[PDB]
């Protein structure tokens, strides 16, 4: 059918892998294993259309800053993630993650995702203001532990990629 590519990015230990796995497997990983690079596949129905989403997991750690760019090419939608617990993760968005994505993938739809909303810190408008400052398709909030907001995050991603 329709095959779109999703690449998740963001600071280390911000909830990227857990978000991808609760969406593809309905499973919250317990032991934090820093991701080097990984790939998951999930099917989703949005607006009546069935789309297979390729979830490209990337590294937020600085040791793997030469490998993560290699996952950007031919991306259909970017998931720029931060932690509501971590205010410094939000400021790394316009300092590190927006400059990097807008260089390798300058015209890809971006969705700012505030992970770990069960830990409520970043106020929702602060994240919304960041989305308007970076030029994102939209701003979403979720918590992989509570499994709340996960479906809507990837429904917005499929919407932006289907365009």
């Amino acid at each position, epitope marked *: 059918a329709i095959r779109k590519k999703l690449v998740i990015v963001g600071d280390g230990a911000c909830g990227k892998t857990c978000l991808l796995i609760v969406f593809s497997k309905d499973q919250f990983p317990e032991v934090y294993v820093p991701t080097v690079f990984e*790939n998951y596949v999930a099917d989703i129905e949005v607006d009546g259309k069935q789309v297979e989403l390729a979830l490209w997991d990337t590294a937020g750690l600085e040791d793997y800053d030469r490998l993560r760019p290699l996952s950007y090419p031919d991306t259909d939608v970017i998931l720029m993630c931060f932690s509501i617990d971590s205010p410094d993760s939000l400021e790394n968005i316009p300092e590190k993650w927006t400059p990097e994505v807008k260089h390798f993938c300058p015209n890809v739809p971006i969705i700012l995702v505030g992970n770990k909303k069960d830990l409520r810190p970043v106020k929702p408008e602060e994240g919304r203001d960041m989305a308007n400052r970076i030029g994102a398709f939209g701003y979403m909030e979720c918590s992989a532990k509570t499994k709340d907001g996960v479906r809507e995050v990837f429904e917005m991603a499929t919407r932006a990629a289907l365009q």
Partner: nanobody
Framework: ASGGGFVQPGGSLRLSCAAS????????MGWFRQAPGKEREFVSA????????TYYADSKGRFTISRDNSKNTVYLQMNSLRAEDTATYYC??????????????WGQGTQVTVSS
């Protein structure tokens, strides 16, 4: 993915994998493993496009990953194997191509069994 066999605790084993396919090339490639019951684990990986860079997950020097450019083959040398390394070992490629989107490929996998 080839090279899997039955080893004793402390034994060695080298796995092999094609560095790139025919209809595609690889900008990077990694080794993964799946224990019985456990989930998929990242073992090691190398990069091709920027520079030949290696990435491991233990920093203990047990696993060594390399590329023989003559045979177009990546090797994963494993020393001092213990029963905790008993798993199916897969290969992954970041597949590039002239008229294909950059895709993620999974190899077939080879069985590794450490005694006890």
């Amino acid at each position: 993915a080839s090279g899997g066999g039955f080893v004793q605790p402390g034994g060695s084993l080298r796995l092999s994998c094609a560095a790139s396919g025919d209809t595609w090339w690889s900008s990077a490639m990694g080794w993964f493993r799946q224990a019985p019951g456990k989930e998929r684990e990242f073992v090691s990986a190398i990069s091709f496009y920027p520079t030949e860079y290696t990435y491991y997950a233990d920093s203990k020097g047990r696993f060594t990953i390399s590329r023989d450019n003559s045979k177009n083959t990546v090797y994963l040398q494993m020393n001092s194997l213990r029963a905790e390394d008993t798993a199916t070992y897969y290969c992954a490629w970041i597949a590039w191509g002239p008229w294909m989107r950059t895709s993620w490929y999974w190899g077939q996998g080879t069985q590794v069994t450490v005694s006890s």
